[PDB]
């Protein structure tokens, strides 16, 4: 009973998230967006963050350790378990981390301030997150298909 | 619209651009939305200039709230790409914001500039 309760809870979470901020859940998904909003306190409390704050939203002990003793900074927080970055790879994962950061800050300010004439379908409402989805997934497939470094092809002899 | 401290007055806008350009040569100026917001949250800023004609205006509508809170003036130019190549980076900055130091004629120019903005209010 507890399990089913949690299941339908998550159903509610995704639906209510689409209701509030369709752009962000068009980017990343209701669960990780919910985690963000949670650590934010509020939607506007999130939307006053800058893009880099969103990139490392969460990793607070790790961040402040590396800064207060001058070590290498953590690269991401909850965006790691977010869905889009799992299809990158390594150095690509960092580049996607930055790009997903900035476009998320965009979407959050968008849904957090842009009004809509309330005869407004959700798709026309979330077109910007959709655009971000498309552009960004294209960029991810590109950097995945970045070639490797041509090396001189050796034959049988050293020739 | 929402850009209610609009600055269309031409000599005013030209003075703002030139001051930004001078400040860009003095490294006392932050280029971009995200960095503007960082600068104001860290409080170091002393003036902030935005651009009216962005297509979703909302990505900069979050700045006036913070600057009303932390009490620094903000003002809109009408042309983003003008602001961008005023910084000198070739891509249309939408938000620039320039800060204070101790002893600079540039600091003086900033003070007269924010006086002009408070006039425009």
């Amino acid at each position: 009973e507890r399990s089913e309760y949690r299941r339908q809870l998550a159903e509610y979470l995704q639906n209510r998230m689409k209701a509030i901020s369709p752009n962000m859940t068009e980017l990343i998904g209701a669960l990780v967006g919910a985690r963000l909003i949670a650590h934010s306190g509020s939607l506007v409390n999130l939307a006053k963050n800058p893009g880099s704050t969103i990139q490392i939203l969460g990793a607070e002990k790790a961040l402040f350790r590396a800064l207060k003793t001058k070590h290498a900074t953590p690269k991401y927080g909850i965006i790691y378990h977010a869905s889009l970055v799992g299809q990158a790879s390594g150095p690509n994962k960092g580049k996607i981390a930055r790009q997903l950061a900035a476009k998320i800050a965009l979407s959050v300010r968008t849904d957090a301030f842009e009004d809509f004439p309330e005869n407004a379908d959700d798709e026309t409402r979330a077109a910007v997150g959709i655009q971000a989805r498309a552009k960004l997934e294209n960029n991810l497939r590109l950097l995945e298909g970045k070639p490797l470094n041509k090396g001189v092809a050796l034959g049988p002899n050293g020739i | 619209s929402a850009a209610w401290p609009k600055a269309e007055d031409p000599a005013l806008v030209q003075e703002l651009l030139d001051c930004v350009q001078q400040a860009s040569h003095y490294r006392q100026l932050k280029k971009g939305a995200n960095e503007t917001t960082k600068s104001v949250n860290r409080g170091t800023s002393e003036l902030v200039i935005l651009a009216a004609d962005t297509q979703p205006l909302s990505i900069v509508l979050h700045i006036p709230l913070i600057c009303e809170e932390k009490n620094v003036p903000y003002v809109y130019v009408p042309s983003k790409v003008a602001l961008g190549r005023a910084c000198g980076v070739s891509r249309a900055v939408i938000a620039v914001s320039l800060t204070s130091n101790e002893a600079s004629d540039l600091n003086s120019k900033i003070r007269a500039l924010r006086d002009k903005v408070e006039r425009l209010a």
């Binding site: 402040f64 800064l67 207060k68 003793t69 001058k70 900074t73 | 860290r42 409080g43």
Partner: peptide, 30 residues
């Protein structure tokens, strides 16, 4: 640079706190 900024932020907050405390401890009236 990053380290310097963090310590700068903390000290800025502390100056804010201390300024408030100093003022509350201590042609004006018509």
């Amino acid at each position: 640079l990053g380290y310097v900024r963090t310590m700068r932020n903390i000290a800025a907050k502390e100056l804010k706190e201390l300024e408030e405390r100093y003022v509350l401890a201590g042609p004006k009236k018509i």
